[PDB]
């Protein structure tokens, strides 16, 4: 007897899945991953539901101010997302203190600007300061909603949260082409094209159509079966695959296209430096994930980075850059074809420059052999006007001749995330 409750409204779009509004309770019958067989207590109908749309009754996840499986940087990003205001807060799983919680509050500083402060929450009973004890988390928030214990700003409304992406159809990895309606061509290339399409007249998706050639079918599909496992918030979601030549790659749809185009647009020109640093931090996070898995990207640049409607950067074309440009390529890969994760680090340096210059072409005014001869002399791109010295230093560290002396994506991610934050200022220390 395991009962769950719905966190968001949901409309059925498949054959045997249920519709439920926010508040409806339900009985779990089968735990089959992303989809769960369940019986509604409101309609008495049995059918499948998305796992991430419900939570066990009176678990912390049912609360509006609680967020599960979310990092400190993600907490900062979500709290700083538009709509929220001064005092916006959340309670989350502590990244460093396992089994414990943390409070993240939106504050304003006359120096930096809009910021997010974090506080550790102690066990045995909960408290931030040893003076004010609280029986539950709910009392803990209820106290600070009017009048703080001496922390930045007082608590207000919980952090705003949108509906999660509805997971892909239950067991629909290899789909027939008939399910797709490639409605509008987004872009074309030497190896194929990209379309905005719909899946079964309800699910907006993107499709990379590959022209038949060097791309060996079985080998490619093996590589794609590898790609499916590499799921991460900073990697574009790979939904389905049409196995019959010509091969179609069905993925999540990114509303604002590539990072290059977005940067070159007006809204992209409206984006201040901290935001650009945030973009690069998200990219570095994705590459850190790829590094942890030991796989290699082989073609990192703003054109192969996609942007969501909510300005979330995701990596695309990962691994695909093998199964089938030197200005983004490390010297060792240019000369001896030795593509490693360090060459990807070099590429990340170039992409960093590309970001800070709002999509400008690297080495402006130079041809490919021009650049090649330049690199031998030990030449690097100069620091742009708007680029911070400390970020340029990161770029330069990415562009070291020896790939061995190049930083990992783990380090780069850590540095970029806390770029404006002194280590001692991550979590506030209250008396
Ligand atoms: C000129 N080019 C660079 C790319 N690009 C544009 C990049 C911007 C745009 N675009 C690419 C895609 C795209 C879709 C599938 C795709 O396939 C993958 C394969 C392996 C791993 C991940 C994705 C890669 C990119 C895309 C998307 N999913 N959502 C929204 N916009 C997208 C297509 C127009 C075009 C050919
Ligand atoms: Ca501190
Ligand atoms: Cl029942």
How is this fold's topology laid out?
Elements lengths: L2 E4 L18 E8 L2 E6 L5 E5 L3 E3 L9 E2 L4 H8 L9 E5 L7 E9 L3 E9 L15 H8 L35 E9 L3 E8 L3 E8 L6 H11 L10 E5 L5 E4 L7 H6 L1 H4 L3 H20 L12 E3 L5 E3 L4 H4 L7 H5 L5 H16 L11 H9 L12 H10 L10 H9 L14
Parallel strand pairs: 6-7
Antiparallel strand pairs: 1-2, 1-5, 2-3, 3-4, 7-8, 8-9, 10-11, 11-12, 12-14, 13-14, 15-16
Helix pairs in contact: 6-9, 6-12, 9-11
PDB class: transferase/transferase inhibitor
Keywords: tyrosine kinase, SRC-family, TRANSFERASE-TRANSFERASE INHIBITOR complex
Assembly: monomeric
What does this structure look like?
Helix content is about 25%, strand content about 20%. With about 425 residues, it is of the alpha+beta class. The protein has 4 domains: about 1-60, SH3 type barrels, CATH 2.30.30; about 65-160, SH2 domain (SHC Adaptor Protein); about 170-255, Phosphorylase Kinase, domain 1; about 260-420, Transferase(Phosphotransferase) domain 1 (Transferase(Phosphotransferase), domain 1), CATH 1.10.510.10. Strands 4-3-2-1-5 form a 5-stranded antiparallel beta sheet, with no helix packed on it. Strands 10-11-12-14-13 form a 5-stranded antiparallel beta sheet, with no helix packed on it. It has a 4-stranded mixed beta sheet with strand order 6-7-8-9, with helices on one face. Helix 6 (about 275-290) packs antiparallel against helix 9 (about 340-355). It is globular and about 70 Å long. The two termini are about 45 Å apart. Bound molecules: ligand VSB, calcium ion and chloride ion. The site of calcium ion (CA) has 5 residues, from loops. One of its GO terms (molecular function) is signaling receptor binding.
């Amino acid at each position: 007897r395991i009962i769950v409750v719905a966190l968001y409204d949901y409309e059925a779009i498949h054959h045997e899945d249920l519709s439920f509004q926010k508040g409806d309770q339900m009985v779990v019958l089968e735990e089959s991953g992303e989809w769960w067989k369940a019986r509604s207590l409101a309609t008495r109908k049995e059918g499948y539901i998305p796992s991430n749309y419900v939570a066990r009754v009176d678990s912390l996840e049912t609360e509006e101010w609680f967020f599960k499986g979310i990092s400190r940087k993600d907490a900062e990003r979500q709290l700083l997302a538009p709509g929220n205001m001064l005092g916006s807060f959340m309670i989350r799983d502590s990244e460093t203190t396992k089994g414990s919680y943390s409070l993240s509050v939106r504050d304003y500083d006359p120096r930096q600007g809009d910021t997010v402060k974090h506080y550790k929450i102690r066990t045995l009973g909960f408290y931030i300061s040893p003076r004010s004890t609280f029986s539950t988390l709910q009392e803990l928030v209820d106290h600070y909603k009017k009048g703080n214990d001496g922390l930045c700003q007082k608590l207000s409304v919980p952090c705003m949260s949108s509906k999660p992406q509805k997971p892909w159809e239950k067991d629909a990895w290899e789909i027939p082409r008939e399910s797709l309606k490639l409605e509008k061509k987004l872009g074309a290339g030497q190896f194929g094209e990209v379309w905005m399409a719909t899946y079964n007249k309800h699910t907006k998706v993107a499709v990379k159509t590959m022209k038949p050639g060097s791309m060996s079918v079985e080998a490619f599909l093996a590589e794609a079966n590898v790609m499916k496992t590499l799921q991460h918030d900073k990697l574009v979601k790979l939904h389905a695959v049409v196995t019959k030549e010509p091969i179609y790659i069905i993925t999540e749809f990114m509303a604002k296209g590539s990072l290059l185009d977005f940067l070159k647009s007006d809204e992209g020109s409206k984006q201040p430096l901290p935001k650009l640093i945030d973009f690069s931090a998200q990219i570095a996070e994705g590459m850190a994930f790829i590094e942890q898995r030991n796989y290699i990207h082989r073609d990192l640049r703003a054109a192969n980075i996609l942007v969501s409607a909510s300005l979330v950067c995701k990596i695309a074309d990962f691994g695909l850059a093998r199964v089938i440009p030197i200005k983004w390529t490390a010297p060792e890969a240019i000369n001896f074809g030795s593509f490693t994760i360090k060459s990807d680090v070099w590429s990340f340096g170039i992409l960093l420059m590309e970001i800070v210059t709002y999509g400008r072409i690297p080495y402006p005014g130079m041809s490919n052999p021009e650049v090649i001869r330049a690199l031998e002399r030990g030449y690097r791109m100069p620091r742009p006007e708007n680029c911070p010295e400390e970020l340029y230093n990161i770029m330069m560290r990415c562009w070291k001749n020896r790939p061995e002396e190049r930083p990992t994506f783990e380090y780069i991610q850590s540095v970029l995330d806390d770029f404006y934050t002194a280590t001692e200022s991550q979590y506030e220390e209250i008396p």
